[model samples]
Target chain A: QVQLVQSGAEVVKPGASVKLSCKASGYIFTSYYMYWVKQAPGQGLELIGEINPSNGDTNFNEKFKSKATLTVDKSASTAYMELSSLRSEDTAVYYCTRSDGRNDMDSWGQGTLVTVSSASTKGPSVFPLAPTSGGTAALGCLVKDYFPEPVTVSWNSGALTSGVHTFPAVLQSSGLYSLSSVVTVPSSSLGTQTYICNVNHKPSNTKVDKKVEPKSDKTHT
Target chain B: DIVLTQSPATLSVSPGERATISCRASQRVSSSTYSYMHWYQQKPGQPPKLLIKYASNLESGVPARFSGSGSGTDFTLTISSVEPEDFATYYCQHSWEXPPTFGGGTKLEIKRTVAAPSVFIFPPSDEQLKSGTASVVCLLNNFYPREAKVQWKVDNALQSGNSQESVTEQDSKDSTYSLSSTLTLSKADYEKHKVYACEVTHQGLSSPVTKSFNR
Candidate 1:
């Protein structure tokens, strides 16, 4: 059995650096390979690179061959990806999916968010927003697994705020159904670090924890 | 240098769900041109795996739902469906040829079933630490009356530091040398995937023959 749970969203600025994680569990981590993928907020998926923890072997998509670095710690069954010199265009939902030598995203982590922002004279001021302070907030997983068809976004963060949040139906351009969902919690309630995403699907049903961060006031720092 | 790996050893998908294929590289794979992007899908009893040549160009016969994108090193290969027809394994191959390698195949099991090893590992970095360290080792034996040397160098060095651990074996003609080289390093080095070349100096051959790892 294998599972790939990705890290949380990352907010980066153009010309900056961002590192993401894809943590694995349930098997001899070194027995397989860890792969890093990129899916723009509302776009298709891209294969960035691959790495074997046992021997630190790596292969990269030539295009991204120069922008990403892949490394893994077999002991922890975790893989890390550091993105350098990022720009607004690099702002996408970065994911760490698991592969065994073969191609197939059999196990996936709730994707981590990477928002690339830059200050421009003509553009509006960019600021960080927190999920606390009695303000409305939304945390989600935008799985652009299909195209042409309108996305059927689901609210997995039910009125209860616990358990896996799931969407009902997503119509693919070809009529097949794929969906995206997000789990959220009020920052204030997470006094420290304790929250996660629970996903239920056939073939495999699992829960993923979101690194709980302090919900801060977006008004200032 | 590009190395590819995968997990779970296998995948089990329903007829209509999606399968995500991922490929990772050792260093930044960007080149002066082409972006070094390409993807391939292999079905059982088939030689033509869907090839996503270039960064994201969906090959002519590839299904519309099968798409790829991303640059530098990270990438993804998504299959619209694990349709019965798409039940075989999928592998990702790289075009940044040092030796041009492919990721171990990801076999889509019917969902929960398991199988044997279908993956392979690539040469690792971090072996280029010290000034002269044996990064990789290949034991040569059974070539009676013939001699061989570890002719591979990383980052442009002889890659020494071996006690020349040797094992002897006898054949019809003469004895041969079976040796192993130990690579020691101090600081981890990240080459632009400057692939290391392994060579052999033999009198039988015209010149120093070489094979490059980290290809």
Candidate 2:
């Protein structure tokens, strides 16, 4: 059984700091990338970024600049991310996600909650739903509630060639994840393709790929 | 941190050999350190596939008969019945961060075992629903009851809300259950199992199984 065991909860003052772990099991440690995801008490999710456990190379959500740092100790098959300068907005659940870098999140850890008190605020969130294929789609590349930094939300859509898809910078509470994207694809456009959601946060681009597989098996090569 | 040692180094099985691999932690693994243990398989050139995680939570789409048991250091990876497609190398990894490491690979080869079941087929069955286009089924047998959830993924993207559309039932054996998920394929949807997967939840097992037809 492949598993990702996480550390315990954290309670920090508005300006304090904390770190979490997504220890991996079932495969070679440090063989893949360790990603971080943030889900507030009631909001959707935000990509924190990913770390190459092998070489310690990291890419942040730009939105998380100065907010979080990702690190790894491959000898132990463990990946760690530290969220510092805590604000009340940081009091959400943090997950140490693992990905093969070849696709969407394939492995994940049970989330660990971190409460940032003293300063109670919210964080930005992305819609929980993926954009419909062939349909027009747009995801906020940046939100003040989270990144506070200016960034572009890019899509693979034809007409939606450019622009920043503004996401909620503040977190909203919804027991169920709420994802939002406005995009559509014509049925005729479906085939061996993927609609990607990319967030340009400086040196790195956080991307999610949704493959538009042919509806008919016969259409596949 | 303790070293993990695996056995048989290499094992050959037919379509159905109760394939098992053992992982012994170098030291006594304490929950205080991290309670979960896991296993995985990697092909010669492909990326590693999570066979097991957190000691037991079986991920979505993974078959039921694939199970994990044991704790506190010594662990076991059992394939109730092996499938031809399962021929590959297996490895064990630890989540205890104080120190992390993966066991050496256990290369599995195909063997003609007379006693094992020759063939197992869980085919694709579908219905053309007017609401969308096509709906397909993926079946998984033998899973724990309460903690599991099934997901229907089209291509590599996760298809949310489909968990409710999927079916899960108690297995003939007391505690385990059977799960079947239906993923609606649209003209816009891609073709290829490699593009789709039935992710299974084993919240109680260890790692959820994301079963992709791309296999």
Candidate 3:
């Protein structure tokens, strides 16, 4: 019943050095060796390296020799991987795993999503799909042309209890991305409440808030 | 790492009633604020949709009827009212520990069950008859609702445990399942009974059905 709690997700620009931590607990850390793996988006895993936690001995896959530096803090029973000289291609979900002396990979950490932001990323253009039908109004927000792809879209300052649907972002042929969301509310609040589609494009570090105010006509694309 | 185990391999429920699928961790995974238990529903040949995250927080756009509850090692995802669209396989994942584990999925089936299995009992094969032991195979094929009872009777004497059942296999194209039970006994025992009968009771059948083998 060993556990390895990894660090939270990260959004970093290329050339930034990122140190991912996997905190070990629930067992004697020194009794096992720790390993790191890189799983690119839509790709299989690649071994990064292994580290002997007890003595801090390190081994690396020849491919990750320069890209990844493995280290272990015995006092804290934690393993760290410093991925340096980051680039867009380095964007992946990096995992910390464990193996016993027999080379049996027995446990793994919940991967940390490490993304490298593109320098030429652009802020998204937002549009409102406003409609009031059958005494009910639903505001739909469309966001387009955002770069680095990791975006979070929500409605108003919401709790998710409301009928909200978010169509996740996808890459486009134009080297940018687009996503859409819809939030349903009562018709009375359509004009008075100013329904907001709050968008957070993490990679671009930009926020777009598209508001709809009752009027459904002349909605921009 | 924690292993997440789900129960009641498949659920049989009528529309409009509640269907609760459980995900119990091998050990405690609950925190003061939340657990790392997440629930997902997946239809065949499609991606899974997350129903609840970090234990009970429903993802945006998920209907309120889809609710989650419980803590520590036990968690349940209850569909307040079963809908036609809600009849799919459910899986629970635990991420608090290393090597996050997901429970074996639980598939939902509406109570509109049919397709009673065709059962047959086969005598020992030529090779098996030449050996010290023999196996009587009872095949249950193409049944709906997936649950079937199988028994071997020797002139009304019921036999079990000497019986071994296989994990049922499903045909996604037709929504039917099948399995086999092997009754292993010595050639001496086979002659002792003089005959072997395999019976099946299923939701699709009105009464017990049997197929016999006069060895």
Candidate 4:
């Protein structure tokens, strides 16, 4: 029942600082220590630091000593990481985890994404493109008119993992960016599944999703 | 949205031999910059511990023996020399898009035991034949690894029709699996299929397990 609820995603200008919160519930928050972890885009996780909620005493890895500041709010049972002078390197998901003194993490907060981009932002328009088949059966989506680059897409396929090639984002004349991505589906799932495409653009506070129903004799009976 | 799939539902490897498990995504699970596939290991009765993130980097303190590589839609997890304790379930998950997805787990076990099932075929009873159809039952018992294929072939010809075929059942009390195939056929076809045989195939056996019914 232990849970750590972190703040929502953030879009900030480079050099600006962002404070992320991880509120604890279903346990005695002050008794256990809270740890902060960071994962840059396509990178491994790094232990930023650990903070004692009871006293605010902190221990941080030397790598993150100058980059992160850890603190706690004993009254609200919340832990915070106030990152300093964010940059492109700091544009990653930050996780606030609860540890049982042994350094064993017991509960974790859903990560918070901090996008340190200076560009003026715009949300993406997502659309289901087409269902293609050759080496394997697949369906794709188009996300266009998004700003500040990198966006997240989720397709609902439990199997058929390989051969996904997401083309690089193409910049349009209007300064907007667009990209198309395809996800593979098991041939067996074609007829029965109503595939969904979920997109998360940093500028868009809410996730955008579109559903694709497969066409063709092979999929539609 | 990207779809991720894992292969070889179960990976059987010797203790010292290396183990490789593959996970593929139907579409790309990356953005303009980085791909977002991660690997994890779940020991019996414990939460899955992250083994690798961004496909190749190891989590803190995880043994060097376990490794993962690749990116976006295709990733592979490897064990340098699987230890006895490494016999556990592993999973791969992608975080590039919203609504993150996880791979159906791949289980790793030491290839120490292989048990072929015992097969038996029971001929149709007089009561069943009186109903204008024959119900022949092919039963298999006590198979290990729990993966086997059963079929009914008459006079060496494959038989498939009116698939009230038997459902595969597991004792669950152990790793042993039992399969029952009840093939129903019209009285005329039953008489035509003079030699009804129940055949079973398993990883443990070099040949098929067959049982014939003449009565």
Candidate 5:
């Protein structure tokens, strides 16, 4: 007969924080320990931690140590967890469970989805940007302002000429995707290797490929 | 932390058939102070539900078909007849140690297959008698789905004691299963003119299989 009621879904911007609540009833609320678990889309569950409501002592899984904080309100028979520094990776469904000391999660709260989105309404712009100095001047492709998800940005160097390439993407507050691709090339082969930035929109079959070139003065070491 | 290793990663069973899942602990979990191993059932899109606690004790509201057995480091969760709704993931967790851990989990899928075992007894060895205690071992092999029960009797009467232990092992090469049951007897009982018998009842067999021998 024990019941754990949880809060509803939340949509927030990257770097923002979200607080989840779980209210317990129909049992000695303080007698049992409450635990929080996270589940990403189509993934296995991960234990966040557990809190002894009677004394407010909490233990967190080492993986979630810095990302989550656990607290309880004995008077209200409720537990709360606040997740900070949210990112797209933090987008998952969370649950609160009651542990009966026997490692038995007999009761559970309905899951709450916490989505980290930039919330942008427009698609991203892909363009060639300036080069930077390192071992050699690396070419950069800037892909920004894309929205509504389901878009991926990839790179092709016309042929298999590999130095090292890094493409990091981030979800912004406008619900859009912003990414950058940098491929380090030998200074002598700056414009020789034709690099293309490809934007693939799976949901709409719209593909955009732009050839990238280093800035005039920045191309040479 | 107590680690639990589950086998087969995936189990193929059919409706109205049986399914046996195993969980082996890194160390002994059953002690005078506590029995740590427990089993849970988790279906797609739902949280895990407690099915058995203390290794063999069923939780409240659980169906009778689901049973568990074993102590120390080896434990099993057996579903007598798997229903369509029973096709889900199962996990075994131990609470005997701090930072309790759970097994990776085993998923049950539906398939059509069946087989019964041939039961026999391996007589007590010479060394077993020199130790002042001899054990009558029952071997059941070539079983499919691994669902069966063993009963012991001495001189045509039912016997019960702490000397009985049964273990089921699945043969990986052929997916068939083998079960062993051993019943110990004191030297005096072993030397006496008495009969020892093992009766096996399986879902695939129309009649129970019984094997008997005398010392």
Candidate 6:
């Protein structure tokens, strides 16, 4: 009989931040973790991340690492998601769900639509589809449809023994910018195993991260 | 993530008939301690409704007519008798990963049955409105025959300022309909602590189905 009451719809302009709320009742709020899901029109549902209500621990999806901030208020038995530097793409319905002790989503809140509009500028979307080669050592990141001019997109794979990459920023008919960056690394020089693509919109302090963990062809540990 | 894929993209059914929807996960979703797949029904213009959780467990107040089965990577949502209101898009989500993902929805359409509408009032936000103006949304979901009427009242008085109507959307499965309307309020009216109600009038009801909220 657990019920999750969600806040109403929100309409905000770009560059603004909106914090959506979900209040839980009929259960010990701290006994479970709360997760957030986003649904864009025709795009299906995407997991924003989950937060442990007991303490303040969080695990975020790389796509939402820079876009969403999850927090909880034990006193009110409520969990909140603060979406910052919103863009037209962020205009969607978001739902908050509770994880039953075993990591299964058992209860869900009504969704709240957060519409971001009236933007003079927007940030690029970054996605790391997969690693190139048969685990030899190259990765490509997809960056698309950014607004305004002069944006910085880069890769950080810890220290670089030798880094070779291509970044071609193309202007679209809609006047937005798009860039795809691919960084190739030598297997012998890949001391650390983490790869990150950083999409930064400096003026608005927007940074998007897409992280990849490379595994060997022999076995995935 | 344990990605889920739903079959049939769209399901067509008639009242009193049975409908079966399937969900397939990219990887195993159940273990000794957990069954990660869950099912939901999303009526047009409204948020998704939880039908089954943990693969096969029905949620509270959910009708026995709706049942779920299977575990691991395969799952199903079966409606024993597809009611007129049962036509809606269905989705399955798996929680095995940090950020759980949902399957592409399978829309349920009813051929031609008239069902009553259900109303849902979202909770108000905590922020103070500028110039003492506030807005509320009233969702009228799953009314059959594709036609219904909605009204808003404040303290028993009909208030129509800033009233907005949402496009009536037809359910691809059953041909039933759903939509929402917005009611705006002034600082003076909302501060009065009056009762606000959404009244939905449909052919299935002898009288209007009314749901009220207190400010």
Which of the two candidates, 1 or 5, achieves a greater TM-score against the reference?
Answer: 5
User: Which candidate, 4 or 6, has the higher DockQ?
Assistant: 6
What digit string (tens of lDDT, one per residue) describes model 1 on residues A1-221? Answer: 65677765444668988888777889888877777767665343467877878899898878788789998877677899999999777777676766555343345666665666542111011111112113323333323223222232223233343322334333333333343333334444556544333333211112232232333324423
- Model 2: CA > 4 A from native: A1-221, B32-34, B113-215
Worst 10-residue lDDT window, candidate 2 chain B: B113-122
| Predicted complexes: DockQ each | 0.01, 0.02, 0.01, 0.02, 0.06, 0.12
Per-residue lDDT of candidate 1, residues B186-207 (tens digit)? 2334334456555555444456
Badly placed stretches (over 4 Å) of model 6 are A119-221, B32-34, B113-167, B170-215
Q: lDDT tens string, model 4, A1-221?
A: 77788887777888999999999999998899887877665444456877888888887777788988898888899999999898888888888877565234546676887878877778876655444223345555656578765676667543323433344565655677666555555667677767777777755664876776653333423
Q: Worst ten-residue run, lDDT, model 4 chain B?
A: B164-173
- Ranking the candidates on TM-score from highest down gives 6, 5, 4, 3, 1, 2
Question: What TM-score would every model get versus the actual structure?
Answer: 0.33, 0.31, 0.40, 0.46, 0.51, 0.54
lDDT of 6 by residue, A144-219 (tens): 5576533455667435323323343555545666554445555555666667777665434567877744432454
lDDT of 2 by residue, A143-221 (tens): 1123222223456644354221222222213211112222234434445345554443321122333332333334544
TM-score of chain B of 3: 0.54
Angstrom error at residue A121, model 3 = 2.4
* DockQ comparison, 4 vs 5, better candidate: 5
Name model 4 segments beyond 4 Å from true: A42-45, A62-67, A132-137, A155-181, A185-192, A214-221, B1-215
Considering every candidate listed, which one attains the maximal TM-score?
6
Task: Give TM-scores of chain A for all candidates.
Answer: 0.55, 0.53, 0.60, 0.70, 0.55, 0.53
Lowest lDDT sum, 10 consecutive residues, model 3 chain B, at: B166-175
Q: Estimate, for each residue in A155-209, the C-alpha lDDT of model 3 and write its tens digit.
A: 7667543545455455555667655555546777655666777887654567777
Docking class of 2: incorrect
Give candidate 1's TM-score: 0.33
- Encode model 3's per-residue lDDT on B1-215: one tens digit a residue: 46678887789887578998888898998888778787877653233456787788887688889999899998999998877667678878665744445677788876544788766455654444565666665666657877788988877789855775653334433445665665767788876877688888998999998888565
Which model, 2 or 3, shows the larger lDDT?
A: 3
